[PDB]
């Protein structure tokens, strides 16, 4: 169905699944060749450049939440805090 | 004494439930018309003797101005016990009937030992006028003062398709309730009305919970 930007529900912060599965989901990514948008300090370790994307919050990607019903709402990687 | 000065003094309680019931249901009554000690009770609903005179406590009530604003067709209860032992299928006509007429909605009727399978199939008979049956026994002791028994709620239609889109719930979706649970009948429930459950909680203080009908 879709919800707005706004009238947004869920948890401002990012879920330690999502974390989880978003580190792991861009290393799988990197460690294919695909572009790493942080300069490598020297890293070479795809979960470890991940790690590095992450808290420059420089990664691409969209955690979809779908609700119970079906209805879904999009946070990006940039917006999401990250606590932990 | 004998035994007799007992068997009144169960009426008795088994009377005061029924009136805190149908306050709690949402009708008028006062705090000084339940708290009616055992004293003032015997010289009123007795005759010579000592003894109990039941077609002589049967009684009306109506809506508080508050029941109004949540709920308003909710039309007037009637109640009434009765000094036969053994109820039969022919009485009832004469209850059936002076409700049929007066033109209420709510019938509450008090057996004592039981009533003839003859004549409970015929409540469901005379829509849309509702009627309950209850038993002495099982209304001397208000079961909504157990201290496990938390308090219930009902929910005005408009409260209710309010919880529904609040929780994006279907209606099946929702914790329910038997239409003969206990405190089901304390209220009155219809299958569909639902029921806000306000218990206390070691986890936090209180915790809101809801029970649909079936």
């Given at each position: ?28 990514q990197?460690?294919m060749?695909?572009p ?26 969209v ?18 805090i990250?606590?932990? | ?57 049967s009684?009306?009530a ?10 308003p067709?909710?039309?007037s ?15 009832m ?37 509702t009627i ?41 979706q ?19 009305e ?12 209180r ?7 079936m």
């Amino acid at each position: 169905k879709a919800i707005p930007k706004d009238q947004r529900a869920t948890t401002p912060y990012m879920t330690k699944y999502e974390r989880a599965r978003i580190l792991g989901t861009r290393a799988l990514q990197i460690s294919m060749n695909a572009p790493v948008f942080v300069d490598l300090e020297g890293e070479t370790d795809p979960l470890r450049i991940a790690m590095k994307e992450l808290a420059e919050k420089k990664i691409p990607l969209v955690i979809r939440r779908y609700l119970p019903d079906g209805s879904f709402e999009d946070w990006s990687v940039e917006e999401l805090i990250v606590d932990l | 004494d004998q035994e007799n000065e007992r068997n009144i003094s169960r009426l008795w309680r088994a009377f005061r439930t029924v009136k805190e019931m149908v306050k709690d249901r949402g009708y008028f009554i006062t705090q000084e018309e339940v708290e009616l000690p055992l004293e003032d009770f015997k010289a009123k609903y007795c005759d010579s003797m000592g003894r109990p005179q039941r077609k002589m406590m049967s009684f009306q009530a109506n809506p508080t101005e508050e029941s109004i604003s949540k709920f308003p067709d909710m039309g007037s209860l009637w109640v009434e016990f009765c000094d036969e032992p053994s109820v039969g299928v022919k009485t009832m006509k004469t209850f059936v009937i002076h409700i049929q007429e007066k033109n209420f909605q709510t019938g509450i009727f008090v057996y004592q030992n039981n009533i003839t399978p003859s004549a409970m199939k015929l409540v469901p008979s005379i829509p849309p006028a509702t009627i309950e049956t209850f038993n002495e026994a099982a209304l001397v002791v208000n079961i909504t003062h157990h201290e496990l028994v938390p308090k219930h709620i009902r929910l005005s239609s408009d409260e209710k398709r309010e919880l529904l889109k609040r929780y994006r719930l279907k209606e099946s979706q929702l914790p329910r309730i038997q239409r003969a649970d206990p405190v089901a009948l304390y209220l009155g429930l219809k299958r569909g009305e639902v029921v806000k459950i306000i218990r206390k909680s070691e986890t936090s203080g209180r915790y809101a919970s809801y029970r649909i009908c079936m």
